[PDB]
Amino acid sequence: MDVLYSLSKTLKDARDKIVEGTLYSNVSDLIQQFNQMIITMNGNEFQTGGIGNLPIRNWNFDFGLLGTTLLNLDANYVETARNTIDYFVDFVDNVCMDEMVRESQRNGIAPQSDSLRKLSGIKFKRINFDNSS
Amino acid sequence: MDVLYSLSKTLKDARDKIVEGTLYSNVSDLIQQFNQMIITMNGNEFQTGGIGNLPIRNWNFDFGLLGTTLLNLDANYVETARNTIDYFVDFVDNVCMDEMVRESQRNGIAPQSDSLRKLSGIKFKRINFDNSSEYIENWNLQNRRQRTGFTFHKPNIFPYSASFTLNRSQPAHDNLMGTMWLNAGSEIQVAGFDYSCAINAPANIQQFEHIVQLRRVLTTATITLLPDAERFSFPRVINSADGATTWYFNPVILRPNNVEVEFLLNGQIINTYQARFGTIIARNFDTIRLSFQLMRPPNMTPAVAALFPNAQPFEHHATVGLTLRIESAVCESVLADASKTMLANVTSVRQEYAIPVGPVFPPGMNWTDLITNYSPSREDNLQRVFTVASIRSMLV
Amino acid sequence: MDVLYSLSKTLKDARDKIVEGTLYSNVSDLIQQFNQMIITMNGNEFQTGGIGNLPIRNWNFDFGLLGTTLLNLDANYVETARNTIDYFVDFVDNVCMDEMVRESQRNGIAPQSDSLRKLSGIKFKRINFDNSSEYIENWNLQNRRQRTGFTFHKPNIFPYSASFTLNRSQPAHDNLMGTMWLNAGSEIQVAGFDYSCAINAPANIQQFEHIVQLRRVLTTATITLLPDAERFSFPRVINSADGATTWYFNPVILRPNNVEVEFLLNGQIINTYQARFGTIIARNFDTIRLSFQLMRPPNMTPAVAALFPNAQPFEHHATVGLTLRIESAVCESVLADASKTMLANVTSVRQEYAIPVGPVFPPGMNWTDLITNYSPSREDNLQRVFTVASIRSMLV
Amino acid sequence: MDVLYSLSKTLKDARDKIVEGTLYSNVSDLIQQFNQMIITMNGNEFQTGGIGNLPIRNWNFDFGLLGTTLLNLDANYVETARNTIDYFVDFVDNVCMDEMVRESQRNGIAPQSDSLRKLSGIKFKRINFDNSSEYIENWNLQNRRQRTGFTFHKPNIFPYSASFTLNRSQPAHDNLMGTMWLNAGSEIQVAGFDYSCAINAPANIQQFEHIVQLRRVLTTATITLLPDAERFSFPRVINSADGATTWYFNPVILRPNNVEVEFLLNGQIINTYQARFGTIIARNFDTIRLSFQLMRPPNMTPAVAALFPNAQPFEHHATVGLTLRIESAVCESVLADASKTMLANVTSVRQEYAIPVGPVFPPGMNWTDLITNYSPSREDNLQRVFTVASIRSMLV
Amino acid sequence: PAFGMQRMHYRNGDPQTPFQIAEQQIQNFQVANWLHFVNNNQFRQVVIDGVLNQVLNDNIRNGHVVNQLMEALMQLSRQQFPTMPVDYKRSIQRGILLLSNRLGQLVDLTRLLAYNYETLMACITMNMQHVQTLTTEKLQLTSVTSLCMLIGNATVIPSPQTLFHYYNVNVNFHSNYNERINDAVAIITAANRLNLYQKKMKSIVEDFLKRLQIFDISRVPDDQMYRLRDRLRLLPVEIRRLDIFN
Ligand SMILES: [Cl-]
Ligand SMILES: [Zn+2]
Ligand SMILES: [Zn+2]
Ligand SMILES: [Zn+2]
Ligand SMILES: [Zn+2]
């Protein structure tokens, strides 16, 4: 849950902060968090399930890191970031939907969908950051 | 818009964060953003306000920067910052007011005032940073034509409408069958009245219908549905449909029967609730169809039997009611609502400066007329001025 | 879309420019664009789908580049280029067909076919070049939320409707007052008939009003307005509103009186033409109000005075008319018109391969049903399929 | 005009071609042309507006060139180009609107707005490049004293006129011989009616003639000629010529006899069509002469023989007709037509900004009044504003 | 020349520097953004512990802005140089890349320079007033080339004893300056209050300047000597000296 929340929070921050013309000092920590997310997610396969009419979806992560070395973000940077962000947002939305439609009588606080159970592994704990909501 | 929002956000962050005693590492990025704003604005002349009674104001920027190597901010530092902050807040407020009082039929989403047009230049794009507010986020997503929605607590989606329809009528208005409804804000109160209590209706059941077509699609909406309409449950004297004569309504409330709510989108049944009261969820709809029925109680106690005779005169009129309150919803377009101040802010600015009526909005920013005729051009202009009003309320 | 359009545009340029004897300098830039397309497409597998009766087709690209060695193109060069172009045209036409026969309710503007989804990947952006067509220009402007413009000669904006309203009627249908209209395509023919010739009207004037709501806003519209309505000026036997009986209409045409044509936007008056006939301009409107009057002639010659008695029976029913043709207009949404072939191409492709009815379009691609219920989802899907149809018609 | 068109054409090419991913070789010449535009416009101040409600707008041009080297265009390149293009497109739109709202009796072809007069200076001639549109091409050909040609689908060459002439008449208006016609746009319906059915006409034939003088010569004109006139073939209560009384018309349509359509130039017969219907070609003419005869049927059936008595009263009036529709023609002068929007654009711009009536055009740019008195000064001003409107349409 | 632009006909006395004009006239984002930084990388003023300090933009202190420079000059290495003879173009681009490919060393050098500046500036006690001086220190750009092409990764910071010595010399100079000001003011005010109208305050000012130890008094212009007298007259007398005088 905290990992899914951190993925979503990183993506929302990236959508709000990685904008054309902005100073790199506005996004440095966000860029580091985003790259940590990409590194942790790269190489992992996910399947969002086919409960009900929810389509079965498969997700593969092989993305380049967001660049440093710009004083101000330009349009090329925003375009690359937007491609990656759009894919990640689609994945996180599908994971959230797949979790939202499941339930168990006992241990109902624990994750139910396969993707969120996978994301509960230790290897993804690196993604986790500010849990402020 | 992004640049104006970034200016306002920088000024708000400067007010909140550039405070006495704070670690410089708390403010380093903000100080950099603030200095970039100063640098970008220095040497630029702006003119705001040549419309209505909004006075002509000229803005020049020759401000110094803020230091970058002390460890803790002191009172000297805050004093150095505050005068610049005040001038910039005044400028941003005037730019927002200048934009709010302007409209265009062709490109209402595009900037209208001179200052916001100059701020659309590429050189000012360096000021742009974290666009995290709901309105600016929706602005950026809508510019990209991505799916994005505004979240409203009690959206004012229904134009004010207190009307009635008579299915059975005659000049004396003593045996009337029909419906009366109030549509206001996020509330629908509807009531079907039968004066004969469906005495001669087939199966002693009288069906009432009410259709409300929303001007914009609502999604993920929470609805409270209660089985009475307190607005149409007391004696009333009501004008005739042409205003020639007044008729009398003397309700006695019976519980509505076969209560059905159909939330529809493009004429398709999306959500259906039968005999369900309290909280219901309508995921995606543009039309609300309420079907209800007055059923004669087959068994009546002597008082109840006296209320409803077999034939005229009918003095106690059998009424069934429904109340529908949209507590919260999501709409891809902007709307007035009970929580926000955007509409009120824009109206206040327009009234305080005697803005002449333009070709987009109704006079006085009347919401009933605006939501009755919520055209795409009106939606564009309204999103622009509401985003500007949200940017202004960040500082004022 | 931009990539698919660029592919088709490159193929069309190659077909028109790679001809025997032509200077290489005539084609150098085209050859570079074509070779870039070859490089980008090489090694990519595509499948055009099997919806309906469209055959499943697989596409593999392993083509060599076009040569750069000739000063003038010879026949061998043209033949090699023709072979490669033929394969690419087959692929683009199949992709366009696979896109046209698909629709979506959630995101109907987004690509639906798998190949167009693959072509939206960044790797294919190198193919993209000159987007000069009206439909691709509108597509790109819409993607940026800019003011779009589609120019239509005789836009098919009115759904077919041949109806009448009787404001005064009786079961024998001999003293009838009302209107009959045909709304078809770009044409409106309306006619107000009074059987008593306004003998007992308050000032010997019978007012008729016709309100036509356009499903989309039209701008820069050239409109021919003519006094008579030739369609409602001959004897007719007309079904009753419930189809129970048939009534008789024996028109005699008088000159319409106080002809007032209003073009309204958001219920506000934009254009007004009083007693004006011929060509008029409606700059921006979404509603047409035609108000006309049957005025009893104050003076009549004996034959005229004989046509119109003082009381029933009435044999010659005084009819006034109006005809309103939209010759040209501009709309922000796509529409069928009398010149463009987008709708016909989409319909022909859907019928040729027996595409099952989907959740967006009416079950024949029938235009009356589509324009009657022109929802935003329908508009999105229609813009997509019309853009793809234009891209296809560049090659096929 | 050539310079303004070159600005607009450069901007349109830049919009269509400077796109993400495209090869630099696709745009190299365009990039040079765009840079030349920037160089020529730099350091110049322009003012537009200040007439009617058109706002005053100042334009200052200080833009850099595009010098970046790339194999393919990226987002940075496109965004820089887009900023420059947006400013230039706004400027060109304002210059076009400023020129479209102005007129002069003397030298109405010459530029009227200050910005366009400044753009006519020699220093701006460097901007000039490809002039390929019909309107600018005709402008250049005319400036060269070369024969120009505007092609029109359904030219609006006939001013609206629904009139009649009575050759035999009396106060009772019961024994009338004459003609009635509608000349509207590209259509001419004419009908000769004899109430006696040529009972006493020499040889039992009544000859009708109708001369329509075109305000400008038409060439290469495709005409559809149909025997009957559906507009004058139903019962009609028509007004008196002076308006004192009304007369009655009860047509029974006979096929026109000895039909002769003569297309004349300077009173000489260029084309003649005798008993020919359907598509005909009038190659060059300024006048149309329609001559048609009502020939009393020598042999009638009893139902026919009963409609035409020997003497008055005459109840069924023998009407012959003709319909003449110019589907396409070529005129040396500019005209409204069914497919184009230049007139509509000019009228819309004048109405939206409340342009006061000037000394050249009629109020509201009414096409009937304009084309009835199509004077050389009016023609010059109209060609100017139509060329400007075509230039504006390329961008707006 | 890289972007094919017409050479700048710059005019002396223009309120804009050549780089300020170029920033507006150049459309490439790498070069324009680096130019924008250069156009605005002036000292910021801040008072720390009652001492005015000239401090740097944080992007200099962390060295991040060198990346932007790298970006700009990488763009310059890709440019066509339209009319330039190709051997000269190759040489220019390869020299650009010589600086470009030392990005890590240049970031390290910028950080080292900024850290040394800040640490040594901590030891300054008199306000760092920025004025354009009559004479300058001549800096060879070849020495800049040496520093940029030869710096390694060996960090060198001021020694603590070096910092203490620098601070002590600054404090001694500041204290002596104040004490000589006080002595001069006390003597001038005493001479005036004692009605010593033949006393020449010029000798007092000369003694004060000589005791400041860093002035060759023979090369002090007369107008500045008299201005110094005038400013010394306006100052109040230090409490201990004034009490002794009373
Ligand atoms: Cl509440
Ligand atoms: Zn509340
Ligand atoms: Zn009533
Ligand atoms: Zn009927
Ligand atoms: Zn007459």
Curated annotation (Swiss-Prot), chain A:
The N-terminus is blocked. Coiled coil: none annotated. It comes from the Viruses. Residues 62-73 are annotated as: Interaction with the inner capsid protein VP2. It is found in: Virion. Belongs to the rotavirus VP6 family. Intermediate capsid protein that self assembles to form an icosahedral capsid with a T=13 symmetry, which consists of 230 trimers of VP6, with channels at each of its five-fold vertices. This capsid constitutes the middle concentric layer of the viral mature particle. The innermost VP2 capsid and the intermediate VP6 capsid remain intact following cell entry to protect the dsRNA from degradation and to prevent unfavorable antiviral responses in the host cell during all the replication cycle of the virus. The VP6 trimer contains a zinc ion located at the center of the molecule. The zinc ion is not essential for either trimerization or transcription activity of the DLP. Zinc-depleted VP6 has an increased sensitivity to proteases. Homotrimer. Interacts with the inner capsid protein VP2. Interacts with the outer capsid glycoprotein VP7. Interacts with the outer capsid protein VP5*. This is Intermediate capsid protein VP6. It comes from Rotavirus A (strain RVA/Monkey/United States/RRV/1975/G3P5B[3]) (RV-A).
From Swiss-Prot, chains B, C, D:
One of its GO terms (biological process) is fusion of virus membrane with host plasma membrane. This is Intermediate capsid protein VP6. The lineage of its organism: Viruses, Riboviria, Orthornavirae, Duplornaviricota, Resentoviricetes. Intermediate capsid protein that self assembles to form an icosahedral capsid with a T=13 symmetry, which consists of 230 trimers of VP6, with channels at each of its five-fold vertices. This capsid constitutes the middle concentric layer of the viral mature particle. The innermost VP2 capsid and the intermediate VP6 capsid remain intact following cell entry to protect the dsRNA from degradation and to prevent unfavorable antiviral responses in the host cell during all the replication cycle of the virus. Gene3D superfamilies: 2.60.120.170, Viral capsid alpha domain. The N-terminus is blocked. Sumoylated with SUMO1 and SUMO2. Sumoylation of viral proteins seems to have a positive role on viral replication. Belongs to the rotavirus VP6 family. Disulfide bonds: none annotated. The VP6 trimer contains a zinc ion located at the center of the molecule. The zinc ion is not essential for either trimerization or transcription activity of the DLP. Zinc-depleted VP6 has an increased sensitivity to proteases. Its main location: virion. Homotrimer. Interacts with the inner capsid protein VP2. Interacts with the outer capsid glycoprotein VP7. Interacts with the outer capsid protein VP5*.
